[PDB]
């Protein structure tokens, strides 16, 4: 590799620096425990949003709060087929965001996927395991997009050969 | 000495005078009191009166009184009568959720730092036989996360989300006596801002006073530990740590600090008085996922044996449901110069 | 539009696929998929071409109604659309059926399979009980045509008792009896093995099933039927002829007792299933009693049988007998115990049997998708694109 | 002295009888007569059942007290028609001949329990929401308002929204399950735009509930649209203005001097006001109304608008504690009690 | 399956069951079955005037005039014989089978009845293949609007026959997957030198149809089959027609197959991610 | 609506003589109390 | 529900909870001669083909216990009748089974020991033993007189099909 | 309605109001000194001069953008093999400021700017812990 491992290391370090969340009852709303990065009702509880960019197209925006961190990833999209495969995969996963407990239903503007890790998730899951899951996610999305592209190309080749062989 | 009480996180823990019973909040609206029956911990008491998550537990030893505050905007003073713990309600008059609660050294009052940018100093009024709260409001602008009383039952350290570490005066005339002059200041009315300090940024997760109280120390979310001397012209010394943010800090001696947090192991700091400077002394969980004993963030640290004047064993309670009893005596010979 | 909609009822045993506007489904295929990189996922078969093939492994995607393996479900519906129905999915609306107590997440997966893979212009995931009630309208020739009933949907999985009130299924009172077509087939197979020889071991599941297809009937009284078979043993014992797959020859077996012992386990589950022992009449009574009091009586007056396992002769009539007996006994016991001269109105239980009893759900779906309203109650692909899969969580009912 | 003071709250959920000055009720039991529930919206419909109920209360099994030699305090719902009040008074004086008889609206009892004389009580229960201003400890019937939205209507709306999610529920069979869902998960949103954004873009509001039949249902956004019917009646097809707008209007219809005092002591009561975030939402909406139709756009004087809407933690027994305070701190008076001699005048 | 069969199943099973019952001597059962096939074609298997002994299979095409202009009736009479009957109202071509007058072999009649749409389409193909064989160059191209938004152009030249499908992809994903499939089609002559030459033009009509009213759009692609005398000859005419008249549905079917496989891969990856995430819990 | 009417269309065939041509020898006889 | 006995009378003798119904026995035993043509053994032999499938029987009477005992012996009798060639051989097998001693109620190994009651005394024990043996002999005889088809050489399968079916999942062999 | 479109929370006298009273701001980092250092080949001196006087108190975004651009030009001007030594020439405050500038420069990728910024970030992390990244996240007055 040339710029994948350093990028993943930087993202992992920033996630460790950001996935330090504690339970925080709402200051503005009585008896509510809302993710502060979403409501943004108190500016003191919102951390500075940081960006780690592998190039001008692949980037992770990590914006943290006292009780929540939002991690948005822009997946690599070389060509149109990769673009549609990435978008279709992301909608596939985000439709079942109730199972991906740390996943958003809709991305932030300009980004492909968005994870929302609340203090509750770090309570019920190991934080370093969550960081490892996010990095593993970034790697496997690219791997599976490439696999889908290759599978579609091979499938189209076989379909064309099978149709044309019967003439 | 690691013991895994239960899988879900422990919000907060409090020991008793004999260090034989531990009251913990298992990320729930209940307080579980465990006691040592031989060599194993047996859950022997269950306290169920909070309508929401319990955020702070303290145990006054001499009165054996357990004060519990939670997100339900309530404080309860549990007293052991007969064989059961029964609660007395404490009106806090706070519209937001309470976060931290700490008893006074003389057990006459307790402080509840809450999310309404207030600290409720609550004391018993024998005339009407219900607890009464007085609010410290100015200049607290954000939520108070941590508290720690001065060893004179008057002053009060308060860490707040507004990046400011404060020392106020909680001199309630109806329950206290005249406070002696302290290097923090001489004029001590209730709610008086005795001292402030800060940094460029960072929420204050934990504050703790020294044995004599002339020294305060607070750990901020910006991976910094700060110590303020009242004697040395009210001066603050900042150490920007290279580790993850520290959540709970306690003095163990006059010149030593133990701070634990999201780095999942306690760390030791030394305050050189002559130079008035903090230095990293050495992590207390050097190994023989995470190699440290605590698999998740350590949320609370508290002196177990000897008190703040003769601390030889302390206790770290984490978000992994673990309680670790660290003996600094053994760690003295374990590492090179872990003094 | 102009092209008729596609109605596919994907049951656990038999998938019933066809086009709207038709009385009976054009295909009743087994709900089985035979499967072995590249295009190998298209090298599979469904229906009768998948029961037994040399080099293929057969798998049943649907177990107890709930779809287990969704990939196999997608491939199955793929050849349903393109090999059997021969429909362009972009021009035909689809009326899919859902099992009782189906999770909205499963509705979302079905909608995603239909839309993001086949690009259908519309989809309507209909509850099976309401379709059965719709099919029941062909036998009730009065103005008592309401969607309030107690559907006894019995197939090859579990026999569901489903109370529908005002068109909406009361999901808190649905009760499943683990006796269905497969249990009856197993019982008849065991009876045949213990009585007659000459049954090939590899055909015993089929030669029994055909028996259960053609010679079975519920019995008014077990000992009376046994005495009839013993004494008048010429008009009751039938002869079944079959052809052995290996060494093709004709074999004749005496179809006797199992004729009335096939569906009897609907009425005495302790005969075959040891864990479950209460008759279907008691289950229906308990289901309806669990329902609100204001709707209890309508659920008696409209008990609709759907599925092949309910197509046994006199099954509905005997069910009416048993349910009326238990209801009248309960009423008499209550009157005797209370002694307050309440005198409740006598309860009339009416099990609606109809000529479309077998494919009741598909018939209801066809007559539902043959209407102008279906187009204005479907979920258009445009709605899928704007709102999302959530639109397919609720499919509105009709009058 | 006199003593022998008994206070008996007659709430629809439970009847609670005890003695004056008690921090907690001595006896609590559901208002069950057998199985009938004549208590609908706090107005009696079957008086014989209530006669049996009071006989049970004063019977040896519950209190074992002499009615002719005891002082009784009863709780009256707001907007109680005068016929019911008079008939209850006649029942106390004739069928029980109590020496000390007094009845008052639940609003003043609430304020006495919390320790206030002036303020507005928002008592929302299962039948109807009542907004009752009280000045100098005397309820003001003129300014009291009723909003026909309560726990039952919110439960029905939640059932409708759960059907919209594809959950086979019924309005007559699964009422109690949805009621428990509303108690355990529903809350009042603060900014409905922001809450809707959080529901439609994030899965943090999704919570799993185990129905009695074992099926797990994931209740997400509907946690906050169900109570929103209190603020937006049109969501349940009810003509109105909403609880916050109604409260602001009923305060603004009062004397100019008392408006500031009413603002600072608006107290919530009843089960339907236990929703998280309800006081914050009421404060925000009242501030918005003050900005719109009192300040008329400017924000300079909004900071002077002091509003303190506190839901008391001891909500469960507010009426009983108010009765105990009223019948303990001032029981020894003479002109206060309505006695049988005055009845027989 | 890969190749889309050219036989309508519903007709095949219905007529096979009816003929088996008639041969067995059983009383025929009334049939009233309306259904549809690809290209928006409507079938109706019924009984004329209620007589059970006669079974009528009617086919309705929204474009039967454009085929009738190229000898549709002549082909249908030659292939179906006396079974051709005056069409039912609302339908274009009707076949009548008398259940009392079946021939000895029912397989041929059932299979021909299955090929009803194929023989409706094959008239223009027969005409233009004969045009190529006879050397009648310059004859006007045949335009067939087999669906509302998709079109077809058949042209005969000196040494080749051009068959252009004007297809419309509903979604952008359809468009890109079709681009991939057609790119594989274009270079498919490497593995088979005797195959027809497939050309693809996305968003732009070829120069041949530029003078015509061929639609232009981002979702519209044109697929040109160049068929040589080795494919337009009598021996291979049937197979060539069978494949060419279903190529469009074949391509769309395989696009949807690719989407289904892509969903399978996403489901596998989602399951792997969910297992990884549930392993992160302290208790698993 | 149209659903009720289209379902009823079958009533001419459904509203006819008995399904069984004669119940030929193999079904439980009627005349049971049922 | 499972079919029930119908020949119970208030004057019918009771040995424990066991019921001493009369039979038409040609043999000699404690059971008295019955004028009626219907007996508990015959009623069992009739109802058995439908009772054997029932794995849950409610003992609503005391003649019911007689019914279950005769049904279990019928099950054992068909188990031992599968390997036979003639009516005479079958009857000899029935006599051999009857002359043996299956467990009496109370003794270990007897099915439904929690439903039946132990004999009170030695005289009652002997009466119960003789009654059970007589019922066994009559059951075997009336079984063989009808199991074999009216034409010779046919132990008809219509009763052989029940060989492996145990009433209430219990058998007299264990 | 129409009264729900007003955000009362903004007009409340309880929000955390940052002081923002640093003032000063003497043109931030010096352009001439760093230009002279870069031209003379004193790359380490160029980095040291670039990290002096951060615009931690300047409210205007133009000076912050100028300082970020200067620091970015210095950072890409470096060679990879010589980066590590440079990182070791800064104290805790210097490394924290360098990581703030690195995280600022990631937001504007150009050619191989991100490729060398990732090496800079790795070395800065190695020499200054994860607490430096934490301070980058937490600093309200950040470059
Ligand atoms: N007389 C009969 N009529 C119809 N089916 C019968 C009959 N006797 C036995 N069966 C069998 O009963 C079963 C009924 O299967 P059915 O298609 O109704 O199930 P399903 O697909 O699970 O149904 P559903 O669509 O209601 O969920 C088949 O196995 C069929 O062979
Ligand atoms: N914690 C809670 N959160 C939300 N709603 C609750 C809660 N507890 C109770 N409720 C609801 O509040 C209502 C109970 O009303 P309450 O107990 O005050 O009765 P009430 O005022 O005596 O009634 P009524 O109007 O019939 O006289 C119910 O609708 C119940 O679902
Ligand atoms: Mg089924
Ligand atoms: Mg109330």
Author numbering:
A (entry chain F): 2 to 168
B (entry chain C): 2 to 289, 320 to 370
C (entry chain A): 3 to 38, 53 to 415
D (entry chain B): 4 to 37, 70 to 380
E (entry chain D): 1 to 284
F (entry chain H): 193 to 226
G (entry chain E): 2 to 175
H (entry chain G): 9 to 151
Copy text from the publication:
Branched actin networks nucleated by Arp2/3 complex are abundant near the cell periphery and around most intracellular membranous organelles, where they drive a host of cellular processes such as cell motility, vesicular trafficking, membrane scission, and mechanosensation. Among these proteins, WASP-family nucleation-promoting factors (NPFs) activate Arp2/3 complex by inducing a conformational change that prompts binding of the complex to the side of a pre-existing (mother) filament and formation of a new (branch) filament that grows at a ~70° angle relative to the mother filament. The Arp2/3 complex inhibitor Arpin controls the directional persistence of cell migration by interrupting a feedback loop involving Rac-WAVE-Arp2/3 complex, but Arpin’s mechanism of inhibition is unknown.
Here, we describe the cryo-EM structure of Arpin bound to Arp2/3 complex at 3.24-Å resolution. Because the globular domain of Arpin is not necessary for binding to Arp2/3 complex and was disordered in the structure, we thought that a more stable complex for cryo-EM analysis could be obtained using Arpin_CA. The structure of this complex was determined at 3.24-Å resolution, and as anticipated the map was much better defined overall than that of full-length Arpin, allowing for the assignment of Arpin’s side chains. The Arpin_CA density on Arp3 was split into two well-defined segments, one comprising the helix of the C domain (C-helix) and the other centered around the conserved tryptophan (W224) of the A domain. As observed with full-length Arpin, Arpin_CA only bound Arp3, which is also consistent with the ITC results and confirms that the specificity of the interaction is fully contained within this region. Like the C-helix of N-WASP, that of Arpin is an amphipathic helix (residues S194-G207) with its hydrophobic side facing the hydrophobic cleft between subdomains 1 and 3 of Arp3. Contrary to NPFs, Arpin stabilizes the position of the Arp3 tail in the inhibited state. Arpin residue W195 is primarily responsible for this stabilization. It inserts into a hydrophobic pocket formed by Arp3 residues V146, A150, W153, L163, M383, L384, V413, and F414 (inset). Contrary to the initially proposed model of Arpin inhibition through direct competition with NPFs, the structural-functional data presented here support a model in which Arpin competes only with NPF binding to Arp3 and locks Arp2/3 complex in the inactive conformation through interactions of the C-helix with the C-terminal inhibitory tail of Arp3.
